Amino acid sequence: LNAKVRLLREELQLLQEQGSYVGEVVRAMDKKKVLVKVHPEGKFVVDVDKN
């Protein structure tokens, strides 16, 4: 019962995070910067996280 309660609570917590877009890179710009193409807007250069 506690397992289901906990998983529901954490799922509710992550459910607040938004849609995060969808992008496709055309060319990486070395560490961090990296160039990407998103569907409705144009090209951006977006730093990458800890991965």
Strands (E), 1-51: 23-27, 35-38, 43-45
Beta bridge partners of 37: 24, 43
- The encoded tokens of residue 7 equal 């998983």
24 neighbors 30 (Cβ within 8 angstroms): no
We find the least distance from the C-beta atom of residue 27 to other proteins, in angstroms, to be: 21
Residue 26 binds other proteins (CB under 8 A)? no
Q: Does 16 bind other proteins (CB under 8 A)?
A: yes
Closest distance of CB 32 from other proteins, Å: 17
Interacting residue ranges for other proteins, rule: CB under 8 A: 1-2, 4-9, 11-12, 14-22, 39-40
